Amino acid sequence: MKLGAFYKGGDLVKPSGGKKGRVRKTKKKALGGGPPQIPKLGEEDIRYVERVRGGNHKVRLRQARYANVYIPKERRHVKAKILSIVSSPSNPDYARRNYIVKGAIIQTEVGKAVVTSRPGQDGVINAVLI
Amino acid sequence: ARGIVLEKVGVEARKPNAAVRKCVRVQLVKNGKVVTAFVPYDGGLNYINEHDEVIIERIGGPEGKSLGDIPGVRFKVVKVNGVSLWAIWRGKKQKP
Amino acid sequence: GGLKKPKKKYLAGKPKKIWNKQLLLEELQLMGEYGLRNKKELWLARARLKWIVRRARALLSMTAEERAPLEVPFKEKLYKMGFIEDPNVPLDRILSLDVRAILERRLQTLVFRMGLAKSIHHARQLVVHGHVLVAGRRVTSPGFLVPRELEDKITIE
Amino acid sequence: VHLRKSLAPYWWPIPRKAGGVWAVRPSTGPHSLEYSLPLAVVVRDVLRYAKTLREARYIISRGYIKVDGVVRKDYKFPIGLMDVVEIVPTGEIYRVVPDEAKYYDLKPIPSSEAALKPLRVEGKTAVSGGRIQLHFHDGRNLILPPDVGRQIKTFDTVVYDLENKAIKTHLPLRLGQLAVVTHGGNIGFVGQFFEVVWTLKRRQSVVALRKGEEVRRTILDYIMVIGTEAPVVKIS
RNA sequence: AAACCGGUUGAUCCUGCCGGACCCGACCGCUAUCGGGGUAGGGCUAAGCCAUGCGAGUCGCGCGCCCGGGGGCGCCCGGGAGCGGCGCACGGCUCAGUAACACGUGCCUAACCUAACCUCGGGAGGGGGACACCCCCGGGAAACUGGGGUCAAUCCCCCAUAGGGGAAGGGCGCUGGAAGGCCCCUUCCCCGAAAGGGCUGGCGGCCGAUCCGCCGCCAGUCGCCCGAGGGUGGGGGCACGGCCCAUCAGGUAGUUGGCGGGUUAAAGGCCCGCCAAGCCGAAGACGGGUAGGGGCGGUGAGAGCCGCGAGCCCCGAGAUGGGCACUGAGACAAGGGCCCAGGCCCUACGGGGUGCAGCAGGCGCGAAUACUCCGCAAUGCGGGCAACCGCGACGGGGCUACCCCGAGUGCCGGGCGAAGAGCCCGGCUUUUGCCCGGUCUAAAAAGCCGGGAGAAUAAGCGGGGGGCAAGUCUGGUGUCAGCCGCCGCGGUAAUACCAGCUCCGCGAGUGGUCGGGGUGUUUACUGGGCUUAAAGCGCCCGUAGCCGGCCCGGCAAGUCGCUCCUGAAAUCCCCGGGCUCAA
Numbered sequence A: 001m002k003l004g005a006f007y008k009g010g011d012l013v014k015p016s017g018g019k020k021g022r023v024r025k026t027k028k029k030a031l032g033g034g035p036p037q038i039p040k041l042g043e044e045d046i047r048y049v050e051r052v053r054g055g056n057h058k059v060r061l062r063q064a065r066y067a068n069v070y071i072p073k074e075r076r077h078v079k080a081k082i083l084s085i086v087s088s089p090s091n092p093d094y095a096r097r098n099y100i101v102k103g104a105i106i107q108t109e110v111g112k113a114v115v116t117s118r119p120g121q122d123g124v125i126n127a128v129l130i
Numbered sequence B: 001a002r003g004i005v006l007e008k009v010g011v012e013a014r015k016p017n018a019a020v021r022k023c024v025r026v027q028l029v030k031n032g033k034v035v036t037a038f039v040p041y042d043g044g045l046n047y048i049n050e051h052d053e054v055i056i057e058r059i060g061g062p063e064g065k066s067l068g069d070i071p072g073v074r075f076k077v078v079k080v081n082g083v084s085l086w087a088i089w090r091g092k093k094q095k096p
Numbered sequence C: 001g002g003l004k005k006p007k008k009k010y011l012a013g014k015p016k017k018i019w020n021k022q023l024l025l026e027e028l029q030l031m032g033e034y035g036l037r038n039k040k041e042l043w044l045a046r047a048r049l050k051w052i053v054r055r056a057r058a059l060l061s062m063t064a065e066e067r068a069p070l071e072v073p074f075k076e077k078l079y080k081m082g083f084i085e086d087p088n089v090p091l092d093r094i095l096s097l098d099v100r101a102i103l104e105r106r107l108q109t110l111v112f113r114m115g116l117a118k119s120i121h122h123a124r125q126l127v128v129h130g131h132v133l134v135a136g137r138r139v140t141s142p143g144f145l146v147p148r149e150l151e152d153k154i155t156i157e
Numbered sequence D: 001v002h003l004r005k006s007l008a009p010y011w012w013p014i015p016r017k018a019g020g021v022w023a024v025r026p027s028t029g030p031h032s033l034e035y036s037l038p039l040a041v042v043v044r045d046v047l048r049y050a051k052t053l054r055e056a057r058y059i060i061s062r063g064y065i066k067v068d069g070v071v072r073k074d075y076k077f078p079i080g081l082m083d084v085v086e087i088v089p090t091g092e093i094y095r096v097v098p099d100e101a102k103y104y105d106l107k108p109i110p111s112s113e114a115a116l117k118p119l120r121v122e123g124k125t126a127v128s129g130g131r132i133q134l135h136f137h138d139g140r141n142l143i144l145p146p147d148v149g150r151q152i153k154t155f156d157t158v159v160y161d162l163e164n165k166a167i168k169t170h171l172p173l174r175l176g177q178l179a180v181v182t183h184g185g186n187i188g189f190v191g192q193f194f195e196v197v198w199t200l201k202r203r204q205s206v207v208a209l210r211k212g213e214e215v216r217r218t219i220l221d222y223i224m225v226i227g228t229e230a231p232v233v234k235i236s
Numbered sequence E: 001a002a003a004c005c006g007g008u009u010g011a012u013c014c015u016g017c018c019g020g021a022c023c024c025g026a027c028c029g030c031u032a033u034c035g036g037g038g039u040a041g042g043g044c045u046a047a048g049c050c051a052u053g054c055g056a057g058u059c060g061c062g063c064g065c066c067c068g069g070g071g072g073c074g075c076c077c078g079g080g081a082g083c084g085g086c087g088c089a090c091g092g093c094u095c096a097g098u099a100a101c102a103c104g105u106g107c108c109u110a111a112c113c114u115a116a117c118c119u120c121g122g123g124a125g126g127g128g129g130a131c132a133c134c135c136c137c138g139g140g141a142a143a144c145u146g147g148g149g150u151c152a153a154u155c156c157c158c159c160a161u162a163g164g165g166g167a168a169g170g171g172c173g174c175u176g177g178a179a180g181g182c183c184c185c186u187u188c189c190c191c192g193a194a195a196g197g198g199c200u201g202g203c204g205g206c207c208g209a210u211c212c213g214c215c216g217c218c219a220g221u222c223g224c225c226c227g228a229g230g231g232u233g234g235g236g237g238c239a240c241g242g243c244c245c246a247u248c249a250g251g252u253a254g255u256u257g258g259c260g261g262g263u264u265a266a267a268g269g270c271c272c273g274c275c276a277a278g279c280c281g282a283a284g285a286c287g288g289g290u291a292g293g294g295g296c297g298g299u300g301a302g303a304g305c306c307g308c309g310a311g312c313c314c315c316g317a318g319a320u321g322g323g324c325a326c327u328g329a330g331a332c333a334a335g336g337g338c339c340c341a342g343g344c345c346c347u348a349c350g351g352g353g354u355g356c357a358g359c360a361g362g363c364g365c366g367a368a369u370a371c372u373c374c375g376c377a378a379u380g381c382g383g384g385c386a387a388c389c390g391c392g393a394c395g396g397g398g399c400u401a402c403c404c405c406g407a408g409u410g411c412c413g414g415g416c417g418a419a420g421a422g423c424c425c426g427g428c429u430u431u432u433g434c435c436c437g438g439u440c441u442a443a444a445a446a447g448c449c450g451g452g453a454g455a456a457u458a459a460g461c462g463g464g465g466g467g468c469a470a471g472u473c474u475g476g477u478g479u480c481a482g483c484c485g486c487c488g489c490g491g492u493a494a495u496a497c498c499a500g501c502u503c504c505g506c507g508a509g510u511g512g513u514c515g516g517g518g519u520g521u522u523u524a525c526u527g528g529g530c531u532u533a534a535a536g537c538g539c540c541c542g543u544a545g546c547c548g549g550c551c552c553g554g555c556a557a558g559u560c561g562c563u564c565c566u567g568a569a570a571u572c573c574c575c576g577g578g579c580u581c582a583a
């Protein structure tokens, strides 16, 4: 979304560590961001198409069950099932709360897989077998 | 600026000159400061009364300070109750 | 932040010390000779003269190559106005011009010098009241600077 | 959207002080805003057929004016370089050609020439099916097969048939061709492309045209080849 | 005109300050006839409070219904309440915040989005639904709003296909300075179009006056959807440039950077998890003060100084203070929403509305200020196929000593008067003022042409001792009253005060106080001074900085020459032309 609660605009701090005044009192809607929308490991896949800036659309995986796991050693794509998240190297809190992010390790039925997609931005979990 | 006249005062001219230049004490509306304002013109003081609204204006002189023989006066009266003291003195207008 | 507004054009002719007795005498002489309304008219004429003289000075200060495409048209325009009588004089002679040459080009002055009026003030009254025709049209401004080609086309009603 | 008269382009043939505070804003069409003139401005200030914006809009709305083979009923339609303007009830045909004095002028052209437009190629893209889309100087596009698209390079010129939607001829950018300056300062000059300094950015290369002994310089972006020693279409 | 004048002495040469004379801006006093040109007017004062009115609509060629007139073919014309599309994020105001990528100049986005419009290529098949107006009932003080019934769509939704996105592998090929991009091939996952709708004409068929339609085809035309590019607007980044203070020297701890992620349309400590100690500073950090930036403006011969850097144009920010969102291509939205604060208005006490920094207008403040007027005719914009409609934008007048321009307040001869003013006499003219017509004007007003009587309707402000032009003329007062920017007068014989007469300067203006420039070579680059006039630190070491020997070779950074892309317009200088010249 474009939310003032998740403003991505500039700081008020200079590189010298000092403060600077606010050139603009209000927060631009163009500079607003949104909350995290990474999927939670669940019992069925739930997808939600959201309207974004300029009328485009973004598919959000609000809950993820299946992963498109690719085996390069077989050159094959299999739609596997996620038993669990083994680790989230970006932040362990994601794996602890059972959230799937890019670079996360997931134990699917084919084995361990690295998530090669942005599940909060792409709406699907493309994974590569390890 | 504007002011309200409080008392009529007379300052003594500087040493070589002998005279009692007649001024008033004026309290400015915007600040409340009380300052001595010279009332020019022969008989000009008689057109001034206590509690009369006056227009206070710089006396001239070098660098905005006091004038020739008047010690420590920086202002003078230009208007009395909305009518110019010059016009009142010349008879072109009557003080309201 | 500045907004441009028009300025007085007679400032270049107006002197900075008015209280000189010699300057007052010469200005009074010129004013009475040509029947001018006030000192502003004389100072406007002097401003015109100052423009002409400073243009001459500037063209003199420019190099020969730069001066070449401007020297002849400048003298031609002065001759056509009537301020200079010989359009082929040297440029430095233009520096010695006089305000009386500009004052002669006034419509009131020309009406008096053509013998159409009993006096210069009567010529001014004629131009004001509209009895002076310039090539068929009434020119009612006594301060109009008549050119050489239009000088002979002045009539009375 | 509004166009303040101060922000109107400087080459436009309109007074800068005497008039209203507004100018007719071109309606985002097939040219650049600063290198095009609206159709109402062409009708009122360039041809003097209409005395007001109301009369110009009436004339345009009737469909009397044709631009590049298509009737234009919008009074804000942009008109730009090399466009063919055709008046229907009178039969007069102009080309918007570069001009030394007015920077862009409507010069009458023959009826046989009215169906051709010399368009400078501005770029190429690869599109679906493996085809090549040529993008021209006025935003027009042409999709062609890859083999014909391979040999046409940027900054070339093509004489294009408006009525057939085809490339009548291709004029490649070579030294010694006749070129016209379509932009800045040295505008309208026609001469022989005889000298180039190839900068690292190809668009900013220094080009020199010659007309006998008349040598002018511009950048490569600002010239358009209009053929060899004789221009293909009447530009002057 | 590249200017000096008065003042410190018994007198003299200096220094040096203060005053005079000029221009501009603000306010103010006395006075004021006309016309033209111009983007003048609560800015310099509270972003202080507001009664009242107006200030964004348009489309029947998207849609159904109702009403009235007309007519027979398949409807014609007009109106109404609406749904629906597009617009209202442009335009108008103001100057609190801001010393900042705000602004200006020069470049980027290969890190991005964009309705409307343009072009090229392709597509438009099947099906379904609801809500207004309306009818029957209301409720409520009002605001607003409930239930049932019922007709539609270019309204809303599903299905199919096209298309799209993510991950991975490969490639001749494209663009481009350079591919993390485009195209092609391969695999999986995921998302997922459209209005053939309106009109016109033609054809055919179904149907009925209880209808005036529905359907199939064709052509024209305005439209709809996908892909690519452009256009326009917007988001973001970069280098450099433009204030004061050291009686402000250390500041910073998400602070500086890296790595991995989230979010975004998109890069980024934008945000998050871990890791390191980094980053700024005397070439002035940090702190404080002041201020919207620019084009530009005033002044001076110029260098320069100043901001009147108010009005006009461009960018920025804001809409009582502070926050947060909906819709939408675009807002966190001045005449839309929600909350806290702080006010206020209506009420039937249960509720509702509201903040003029929109155009008029009122209160307040202050030294200081315009009509609650007229029109969409010009300039443009939104809507519409169009015709047209709307617009306190804009245009027009009003008021106001806003700036510039051109004129009048008579001319001629004679007399008295002084050669002056003035009066009288004889003649002339009618700008101007007054009345009428045409033209002009959206209409008016004014302007211009023409007609009528008529000298007839029209001059003030400051000053006269020197500076500094103008009285040792007259009366009054008598160091009192008063003058006086400076020097200085007045204490009985005043050229200086109060009056008369008279003269002087400028003149529809002329004066007072302020601020800027000149003055001023008293800020000194051009271009000052430091023995004694103000001014060499008590002396020395040395960091940054500034300044630096000779010759030869290379470079070409400064420098110089030419050229190109630029530095918006207006403004400024020159030239030509058009307003009666002028402005």
Ligand SMILES: [Mg+2]
Pocket: B066, B067, B068
């Ligand atoms: Mg003194």
Ligand SMILES: [Mg+2]
Pocket: E009
């Ligand atoms: Mg002495």
Ligand SMILES: [Mg+2]
Pocket: E042
């Ligand atoms: Mg205000």
Ligand SMILES: [Mg+2]
Pocket: E061, E198, E222
């Ligand atoms: Mg239509």
Ligand SMILES: [Mg+2]
Pocket: none
């Ligand atoms: Mg209706």
Ligand SMILES: [Mg+2]
Pocket: none
């Ligand atoms: Mg705006």
Ligand SMILES: [Mg+2]
Pocket: E154
């Ligand atoms: Mg639709």
Ligand SMILES: [Mg+2]
Pocket: none
């Ligand atoms: Mg693609």
Ligand SMILES: [Mg+2]
Pocket: E192
């Ligand atoms: Mg679908």
Ligand SMILES: [Mg+2]
Pocket: none
């Ligand atoms: Mg349908």
Ligand SMILES: [Mg+2]
Pocket: none
């Ligand atoms: Mg990222």
Ligand SMILES: [Mg+2]
Pocket: A011, A013, E254, E269
């Ligand atoms: Mg930060």
Ligand SMILES: [Mg+2]
Pocket: E300
């Ligand atoms: Mg000087």
Ligand SMILES: [Mg+2]
Pocket: none
């Ligand atoms: Mg204004």
Ligand SMILES: [Mg+2]
Pocket: E322
């Ligand atoms: Mg607020």
Ligand SMILES: [Mg+2]
Pocket: E333
């Ligand atoms: Mg709001």
